[PDB]
Design a protein around this nucleic acid. Structure first.
Ligand SMILES: [Zn+2]
Length: 269
DNA sequence: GCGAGAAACAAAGA
DNA sequence: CTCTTTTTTCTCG
């Protein structure tokens, strides 16, 4: 998932599991708990979920007064809320069991991660990750963004994917944003003029906020599967279809190892 | 520091 | 059968 999908999951979880006491925690794939599964089980069993936050693509469970469970879903991690008697599915790895149901984490590629840290360690954790600002008018300062772009010869797509200029874009929304802002994904950032940087800045915020409002892009039933943003995608996965602005065919290339969808007319090299 | 390429892993498709 | 394709963080040179 990307930021809008993780936000959607966060909202659904906030509505449903906040106030629940964790009765037990079980793992078939304990190795995805990076801080140690048996340790997490000992610390969190019997604790109550107080809240669910998000930073970039990271989900943050607030559990008891002092614990933060940082969850990253990577490529295809999925959470679902199930009855206590629900049958195991092949790629289920972890479950948090409550009195009346269970939260199950599944991940076909086993990329997703859980790390248990303390409340006062959350800010240092994200500073160490070098995550940039949230994609909002309030947090995402255009002036710093512009100065970072001016100083770099990186290509704009890979630089945006780093999470350091702004948090939350993955392959789908970065392609969508660059199409919206009329910028070629291989454009060296020090070549971008002030007005293009402005349009890029605003387009990042607009696309991600629209995606959130629409409940994410659900591509292929787990939490956040009721999204509608996929119906608004202009380029990602649209190879051979026509650009909605100009009518040229959307092309797909490879940029820094990633599949990259763009309009060659609207996004001049 | 940089960019290229690839691994962690599994499945699906050519 | 092989090769390619689908978030983060590493090694390599
Ligand atoms: Zn176009």
């Amino acid at each position: 998932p990307e930021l809008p999908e993780v936000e959607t999951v966060r909202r659904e979880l906030e509505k449903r599991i906040v106030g629940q006491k964790i009765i037990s925690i079980e793992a078939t794939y304990p190795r995805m708990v990076l801080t140690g599964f048996e340790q997490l089980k000992k610390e969190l069993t019997g604790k109550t979920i107080q809240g669910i936050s998000r930073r970039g693509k990271y989900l943050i469970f607030e559990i008891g007064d002092d614990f933060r469970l940082i969850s990253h879903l990577r490529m295809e991690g999925k959470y679902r809320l199930a009855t206590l008697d629900a049958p195991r599915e092949k790629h289920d790895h972890l479950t948090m069991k409550f009195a009346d149901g269970q939260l199950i984490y599944a991940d076909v590629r086993k990329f997703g991660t859980w790390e248990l840290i303390s409340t006062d360690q959350v800010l240092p954790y994200f500073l160490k990750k070098k995550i940039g600002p949230e994609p909002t008018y309030e947090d995402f300062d255009e002036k710093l963004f512009r100065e970072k772009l001016r100083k770099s010869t990186k290509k704009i797509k890979p630089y945006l994917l780093e999470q350091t200029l702004v948090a939350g874009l993955g392959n789908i929304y970065v392609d969508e944003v660059l199409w919206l802002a009329k910028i070629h994904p291989e454009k060296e950032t020090n070549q971008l003029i002030e007005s293009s940087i402005h349009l890029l800045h605003d387009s990042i915020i607009e696309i991600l906020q629209k995606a959130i409002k629409l409940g994410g892009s659900s591509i292929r039933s787990a939490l956040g599967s009721t999204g509608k943003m996929q119906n608004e995608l202009q380029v990602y996965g649209k190879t051979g279809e026509k650009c909605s602005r100009c009518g040229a065919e959307i092309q797909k290339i490879k940029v820094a190892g990633r599949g990259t969808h763009f309009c060659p007319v609207c996004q001049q090299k």
